Structure formats: C-alpha cells, structure tokens
Write a protein that holds these residues in place. Structure first.
Motif, PDB file in Angstrom:
ATOM      1  N   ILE A   6       0.847  -1.187   0.000  1.00 19.50           N
ATOM      2  CA  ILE A   6       0.000   0.000   0.000  1.00 19.50           C
ATOM      3  C   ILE A   6       0.884   1.239   0.000  1.00 19.50           C
ATOM      4  CG2 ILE A   6      -1.588   1.367   1.382  1.00 19.50           C
ATOM      5  CD1 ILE A   6      -1.792  -2.321   1.807  1.00 19.50           C
ATOM      6  N   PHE A   7       0.594   2.168  -0.909  1.00 16.94           N
ATOM      7  CA  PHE A   7       1.310   3.431  -1.013  1.00 16.94           C
ATOM      8  C   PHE A   7       0.312   4.578  -0.975  1.00 16.94           C
ATOM      9  CE2 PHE A   7       5.353   1.529  -2.061  1.00 16.94           C
ATOM     10  CZ  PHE A   7       5.001   0.344  -2.666  1.00 16.94           C
ATOM     11  N   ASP A   8       0.679   5.652  -0.282  1.00 18.19           N
ATOM     12  CA  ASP A   8      -0.196   6.797  -0.077  1.00 18.19           C
ATOM     13  C   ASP A   8       0.275   7.978  -0.914  1.00 18.19           C
ATOM     14  OD1 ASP A   8      -1.437   5.183   1.754  1.00 18.19           O
ATOM     15  OD2 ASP A   8      -1.491   6.689   3.347  1.00 18.19           O
ATOM     16  N   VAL A   9      -0.678   8.681  -1.519  1.00 19.64           N
ATOM     17  CA  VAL A   9      -0.391   9.898  -2.273  1.00 19.64           C
ATOM     18  C   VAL A   9      -1.369  10.982  -1.836  1.00 19.64           C
ATOM     19  CG1 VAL A   9       0.642   8.721  -4.232  1.00 19.64           C
ATOM     20  CG2 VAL A   9      -1.823   9.084  -4.165  1.00 19.64           C
ATOM     21  N   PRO A  10      -1.011  12.263  -1.953  1.00 18.00           N
ATOM     22  CA  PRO A  10      -1.944  13.319  -1.516  1.00 18.00           C
ATOM     23  C   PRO A  10      -3.254  13.332  -2.285  1.00 18.00           C
ATOM     24  CG  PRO A  10       0.285  14.168  -1.689  1.00 18.00           C
ATOM     25  CD  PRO A  10       0.313  12.804  -2.297  1.00 18.00           C
ATOM     26  N   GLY A  11      -3.201  13.275  -3.613  1.00 20.05           N
ATOM     27  CA  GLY A  11      -4.398  13.353  -4.421  1.00 20.05           C
ATOM     28  C   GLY A  11      -4.284  12.484  -5.652  1.00 20.05           C
ATOM     29  N   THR A  21       6.939   5.321 -11.460  1.00 25.08           N
ATOM     30  CA  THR A  21       8.132   5.072 -10.658  1.00 25.08           C
ATOM     31  C   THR A  21       8.143   3.650 -10.109  1.00 25.08           C
ATOM     32  OG1 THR A  21       8.149   7.411 -10.053  1.00 25.08           O
ATOM     33  CG2 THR A  21       9.519   5.922  -8.756  1.00 25.08           C
ATOM     34  N   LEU A  22       6.992   3.162  -9.647  1.00 29.92           N
ATOM     35  CA  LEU A  22       6.941   1.819  -9.077  1.00 29.92           C
ATOM     36  C   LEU A  22       7.072   0.748 -10.153  1.00 29.92           C
ATOM     37  CD1 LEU A  22       4.152   2.364  -6.423  1.00 29.92           C
ATOM     38  CD2 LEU A  22       6.478   1.603  -5.935  1.00 29.92           C
ATOM     39  N   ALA A  23       6.526   1.002 -11.343  1.00 28.33           N
ATOM     40  CA  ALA A  23       6.522  -0.012 -12.392  1.00 28.33           C
ATOM     41  C   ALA A  23       7.921  -0.266 -12.938  1.00 28.33           C
ATOM     42  CB  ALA A  23       5.580   0.406 -13.519  1.00 28.33           C
ATOM     43  N   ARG A  24       8.750   0.774 -13.018  1.00 25.26           N
ATOM     44  CA  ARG A  24      10.054   0.639 -13.652  1.00 25.26           C
ATOM     45  C   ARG A  24      11.053  -0.140 -12.809  1.00 25.26           C
ATOM     46  NH1 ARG A  24      12.867   4.414 -16.695  1.00 25.26           N
ATOM     47  NH2 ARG A  24      13.431   5.591 -14.814  1.00 25.26           N
ATOM     48  N   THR A  25      10.722  -0.459 -11.563  1.00 24.96           N
ATOM     49  CA  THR A  25      11.597  -1.247 -10.707  1.00 24.96           C
ATOM     50  C   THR A  25      11.335  -2.742 -10.811  1.00 24.96           C
ATOM     51  OG1 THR A  25      10.270  -1.408  -8.691  1.00 24.96           O
ATOM     52  CG2 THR A  25      11.337   0.695  -9.148  1.00 24.96           C
ATOM     53  N   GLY A  26      10.456  -3.167 -11.713  1.00 25.36           N
ATOM     54  CA  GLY A  26      10.006  -4.547 -11.679  1.00 25.36           C
ATOM     55  C   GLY A  26       9.209  -4.784 -10.412  1.00 25.36           C
ATOM     56  N   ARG A  27       9.345  -5.987  -9.855  1.00 24.83           N
ATOM     57  CA  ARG A  27       8.917  -6.272  -8.489  1.00 24.83           C
ATOM     58  C   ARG A  27       7.401  -6.307  -8.341  1.00 24.83           C
ATOM     59  NH1 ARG A  27      12.345  -2.232  -5.198  1.00 24.83           N
ATOM     60  NH2 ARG A  27      10.285  -1.399  -4.651  1.00 24.83           N
ATOM     61  N   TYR A  28       6.668  -5.971  -9.400  1.00 22.53           N
ATOM     62  CA  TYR A  28       5.216  -5.885  -9.331  1.00 22.53           C
ATOM     63  C   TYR A  28       4.620  -6.376 -10.639  1.00 22.53           C
ATOM     64  CZ  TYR A  28       6.175  -2.901  -5.321  1.00 22.53           C
ATOM     65  OH  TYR A  28       6.632  -2.403  -4.125  1.00 22.53           O
ATOM     66  N   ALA A  30       1.329  -6.081 -11.255  1.00 23.51           N
ATOM     67  CA  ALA A  30       0.225  -5.189 -11.578  1.00 23.51           C
ATOM     68  C   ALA A  30       0.229  -4.030 -10.596  1.00 23.51           C
ATOM     69  CB  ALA A  30      -1.121  -5.920 -11.545  1.00 23.51           C
ATOM     70  N   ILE A  31      -0.473  -2.965 -10.970  1.00 21.13           N
ATOM     71  CA  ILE A  31      -0.584  -1.763 -10.157  1.00 21.13           C
ATOM     72  C   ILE A  31      -2.040  -1.324 -10.147  1.00 21.13           C
ATOM     73  CG2 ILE A  31       0.033   0.674  -9.980  1.00 21.13           C
ATOM     74  CD1 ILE A  31       2.745  -0.154 -11.271  1.00 21.13           C
ATOM     75  N   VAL A  32      -2.540  -0.963  -8.969  1.00 22.07           N
ATOM     76  CA  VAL A  32      -3.922  -0.539  -8.789  1.00 22.07           C
ATOM     77  C   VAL A  32      -3.925   0.876  -8.233  1.00 22.07           C
ATOM     78  CG1 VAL A  32      -6.147  -1.090  -7.776  1.00 22.07           C
ATOM     79  CG2 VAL A  32      -4.557  -2.925  -8.339  1.00 22.07           C
ATOM     80  N   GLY A  33      -4.688   1.760  -8.869  1.00 23.44           N
ATOM     81  CA  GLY A  33      -4.844   3.116  -8.383  1.00 23.44           C
ATOM     82  C   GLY A  33      -6.270   3.415  -7.974  1.00 23.44           C
TER      83      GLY A  33
END
Lengths: 114, 114
Positions: A6-11, A21-28, A30-33
C-alpha cells in the motif's frame, strides 16, 4: 500467495507518476490506483480526472505493466448523509471487482507470454 | 409606520396558496415570499421552482396585490461549510433589496391610483 503493498499519495493527480516510478523497478505484476474524484460545486473537476485517466493509460503503455483503475467520478455527490453511505457501501463491490480483474489479467498475460 | 406579519409554511410549494388566501382578506398592501430552493443531488428541482414562480405570478395577477419574490435557486449548493457562509451572508443583502422594492412598488401603485 499474492502480496499487496500500500502506497499513499496526496491526491489523484499524483497517481500516474507514482505508478510509473513503481513499475520501472520490476517487483510488481500489476498496479492498482484508487481515488474518489468528485465535483465540489466550486471548481470544475473534469480536467483533473481526464488527465489522470490518460496518464495512467500512458504509463501502462510505456512500462508494459498492467494498471487497474479504481478512480471513480460520481454523477452527483453533495456530501449529505445519504450520499456518504451509498458510496461507502459501493466501494466494497468495486474493490472485489478490481481484485478479480487483476487476477484474471495477470493470468492472461502469463498465458499469452508462452 | 409599516407593520410586518410573519407566516410559516412547510415548503416553497405551499407559498402561492397561502399568498392567495392572505390577499383576498385585504389588510395587506403587499406580500413577500421567501424560500431557498436548491438541488439536493437526488431529485430534479426545477419543476417545483417553476411551479412556485408561475403560481406567485398568477396569484399576483388574480388578486391585484403585489407579490415580491425572494424565492432563490443557486447554481450550486453542496451543503459544505464554504457554501453555507456565502449564502448566509448574501440573504441579508437580498432582504434589504426586497424591502426597498416593496416600499417603492407600494408608493408607485398609490401614485398611479390617483
């Protein structure tokens, strides 16, 4: 077997860059926003929602990593008591649908990757 | 020299009939109707506002007694803290304007009545 971080962003405007930024590190796989973009009755809100959706699609195409969208814009939300309960209840169904979609899309990509 | 009498009604839809009932008794040189008709985000509100304005005009023409309108419909009202203070402040100006209009119209009718 599947781990969720879980990652937190202001808006909502901060979601596409964080996802890139998270996708380019591999390691995932899928990503959910998730965000709730509403019309506050003072300023127009469609510009930000359009920008966020387009940016998420652009990041998805750039990084070849699936990005699921739970960024929802209701037709009407007047912060009344009746409005709060309805969406408070509906977001559970939205989350379950997102989980099923993420599992299915990851499995499909793994399958077509031979 | 001018006396004001206050009457309470449940909603704006009840104003035209009350105004008509009060007008036929004489006893009043003018009638003022005040209401705040807003869009709650669930049901359409323009039908009631249109009906109320048309009914007030019809009563005005029927009874030959002026009816001032302070029935106002804002473009946006989301019951937030910012929205409440603005209209809370603006209704004072609206009331002062209504008082001036009532005095002027009564004087003008008295003048043209010879």
């Amino acid at each position: 077997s599947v781990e969720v971080e879980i990652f937190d962003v202001p808006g909502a405007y901060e979601i596409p860059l964080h996802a890139k930024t998270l996708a380019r590190t591999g390691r995932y796989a899928a990503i959910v926003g998730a965000a709730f973009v509403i019309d506050g009755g003072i300023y127009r809100h469609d510009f930000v929602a359009t920008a966020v959706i387009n940016g998420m699609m652009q990041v998805q195409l750039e990084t070849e990593v699936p990005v699921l969208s739970v960024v929802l814009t209701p037709h009407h939300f007047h912060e009344s008591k009746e409005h709060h309960d309805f969406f408070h209840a509906h977001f559970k169904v939205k989350g379950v649908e997102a989980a099923h979609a993420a599992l299915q899309i990851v499995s499909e990509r793994s399958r077509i990757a031979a």
